[PDB]
Paper text:
Canonical human TFIID consists of TBP and 13 TBP-associated factors (TAFs). Among these HFD pairs, the TAF8–10 heterodimer plays a key role in the TFIID assembly pathway, is critical for the integrity of holo–TFIID and also fulfills essential functions in early embryonic development. By immunoprecipitating TAF-containing complexes from different cellular compartments, we identify a novel endogenous TFIID subcomplex formed by TAF2, 8 and 10 in the cytoplasm of human cells. Taken together, our data suggest the presence of a nuclear import particle in which the TAF2–8–10 complex is bound by the major binding site of Importin α1 via the NLS of TAF8, poised to shuttle into the nucleus.
Biochemical and cell biology experiments demonstrated that the C-terminal NLS within TAF8 is necessary for shuttling TAF8 and TAF10 from the cytoplasm to the nucleus in an Importin α/β-dependent fashion. To define the binding region between Importin α1 to the TAF2–8–10 complex, we determined the X-ray crystal structure of the C-terminal NLS of TAF8 in complex with Importin α1ΔIBB at 1.75 Å resolution. Importin α1 residues 72–497 and residues 297–305 of the TAF8 peptide could be unambiguously traced in the electron density map. The TAF8 peptide binds as a monopartite NLS via residues 297–302. Importin α1 tryptophanes W142, W184 and W231 form apolar pockets, which accommodate the aliphatic moieties of lysine residues K300 and K302, and position the TAF8 NLS backbone via residues P297, K300 and K302. The side chain of K299 of TAF8 is coordinated by the main chain carbonyl group of G150, the hydroxyl group of T155 and the carboxylate of D192, whereas side chains of K300 and K302 of TAF8 are contacted by side chain carbonyl groups of N228 and Q181, respectively. We could also model a less well-defined short amino-acid segment at the minor binding site of Importin α1. Using Importin α1ΔIBB as an analyte and an NLS peptide comprising TAF8 residues 288 to 310 as titrant, we obtained a 1:1 binding stoichiometry with a dissociation constant in the low micromolar range (Kd=10.4+/−0.8 μM). The crystal structure of Importin α1 with the NLS of TAF8 reveals that TAF8 has a classical short monopartite NLS, which is recognized by the major binding site of Importin α1. Our crystal structure of Importin α1 bound to the TAF8 NLS further suggests that the cytosolic TAF2–8–10 complex together with Importin α1 constitutes an import particle responsible for delivering this building block into the nucleus.
Numbering used by the authors:
A (entry chain A): 72 to 497
B (entry chain B): 297 to 305
The structure:
């Protein structure tokens, strides 16, 4: 381990009045920092090199040292928040924005990469990158008639950096920035490169992770049908963020949820709800749960697409984190659904797998299940069939499981189970 | 990924 002497040599070289020595020193720093295993980032920072690197970004008289310095700083910024902060505090952001206009594509694109790492740190550095004016010149690099005229690597790196400018909350990105970027994201969603598509979906998943107003900005672009197309892709790295975006949109208004339904999303859910990735199954069941939180006509679309048997199957057989989402989908369905819809749900066999989860060691899920049972009894009341329902629940051992909850630590569970027993099993 | 270093192959 001789990194400390290498760093000492770099400091000496970088302070040479001979530019060839300075360049060689920056080359050596770039090499150290491009090591896969524990690059010596802190050593380089502690040696006081960041101000030197930032100065070199501006050395138009020596494009190679701009390149080497840009790469070195890219990799420091790829580190911890403290490491990224040292780069920011050194004044790197406006220097990198200036380099976006370099006539040297390899330098411009290295600046793109560094800014992606800086913005990726979080909302504060994201907003600094925006504040210093990065968006316009980034978008200009992408404003060519043919996106295939750009090297695949360059377009991927631009897309990724744009996605980080869309990322994070508290605060969300400035609205005017989102308005600037969104039309480019919509264009990119029709590209054929899978990595571009994946990062563009991630960007859109970020923008839809927020209040209805933000969701509304995305929906109004008309992009939802293309997202639904990507939902059916075979590439997991595309489906994953596409599904997150769609799931985020249906946390919005009934009208926003209708856009997703009208776009044909529900037809994809038999595949998603049975997808061998448990994560896809879970996120798809979460998405379904926010659709069954919708209007009765939206529930009816879920019914009409044959999805209720899929929901019963997930509730019965899936991993517990996915079963939790299925419980929510059921409770939402039963909260908002018509009596007929609820009768159909019971006919599909919801009661036994629902009851079986009352043994779960998750208090919140127990409470959600008891809500669902109460909701189903309310439909039974309108029909004059509360006794038939109570007998069904007894006959599958459901009442034994409800009775058992009178010993539960949680008072709401005790009170809820007691209430059902008093109302319907006394 | 959120952040990414540039490395040779």
């Amino acid at each position: 381990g001789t990194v400390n002497w290498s760093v000492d040599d770099i400091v000496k070289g970088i302070n040479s009045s001979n530019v060839e020595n300075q360049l060689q020193a920056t080359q050596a720093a770039r090499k150290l920092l491009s090591r896969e295993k524990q690059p010596p980032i802190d050593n380089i920072i502690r040696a006081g090199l960041i101000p030197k690197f930032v100065s070199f970004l501006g050395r138009t008289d020596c494009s190679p040292i701009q390149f080497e310095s840009a790469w070195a700083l890219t990799n420091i910024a790829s580190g911890t928040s403290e490491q990224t902060k040292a780069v920011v505090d050194g004044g790197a952001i406006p220097a990198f924005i200036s380099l976006l206009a370099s006539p040297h594509a390899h330098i411009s694109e290295q600046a793109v990469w560094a800014l992606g790492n800086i913005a990726g740190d979080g909302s504060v550095f994201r907003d600094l990158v925006i504040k210093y004016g990065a968006v316009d010149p980034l978008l200009a690099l992408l404003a060519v008639p043919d996106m295939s005229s750009l090297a695949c690597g360059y377009l991927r790196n631009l897309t990724w950096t744009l996605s980080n400018l869309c990322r994070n909350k508290n605060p969300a990105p400035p609205i005017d920035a989102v308005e600037q970027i969104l039309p480019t994201l919509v264009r990119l969603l029709h590209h054929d490169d899978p990595e571009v598509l994946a990062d563009t979906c991630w960007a859109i998943s970020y923008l839809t992770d927020g209040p209805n107003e933000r969701i509304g900005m995305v929906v109004k672009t008309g992009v939802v049908p293309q997202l639904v197309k990507l939902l059916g892709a075979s590439e997991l790295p595309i489906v994953t963020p596409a599904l997150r975006a769609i799931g985020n949109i249906v946390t919005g208004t009934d009208e926003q949820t209708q856009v997703v339904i009208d776009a044909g999303a529900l037809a994809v859910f038999p595949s998603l709800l049975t997808n061998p990735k448990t994560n896809i199954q879970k996120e798809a069941t979460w998405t379904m749960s926010n659709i069954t939180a919708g209007r009765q006509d939206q529930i009816q679309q879920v019914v009409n697409h044959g999805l209720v048997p899929f929901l019963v199957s997930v509730l019965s057989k899936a991993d517990f984190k996915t079963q939790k989402e299925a419980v929510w989908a059921v409770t939402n369905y039963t909260s908002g659904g018509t009596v007929e819809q609820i009768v159909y749900l019971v006919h599909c066999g919801i009661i036994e797998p629902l009851m079986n989860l009352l043994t779960a060691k998750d208090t919140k899920i127990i409470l959600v299940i008891l809500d669902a049972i109460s909701n189903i009894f309310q439909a039974a009341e309108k029909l004059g069939e509360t006794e038939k329902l109570s007998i069904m629940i007894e006959e599958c051992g459901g009442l034994d499981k409800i009775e058992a909850l009178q010993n539960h630590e949680n008072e709401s569970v005790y009170k809820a189970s007691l209430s059902l027993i008093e109302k319907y099993f006394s | 990924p959120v952040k990414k270093p540039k490395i040779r192959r």
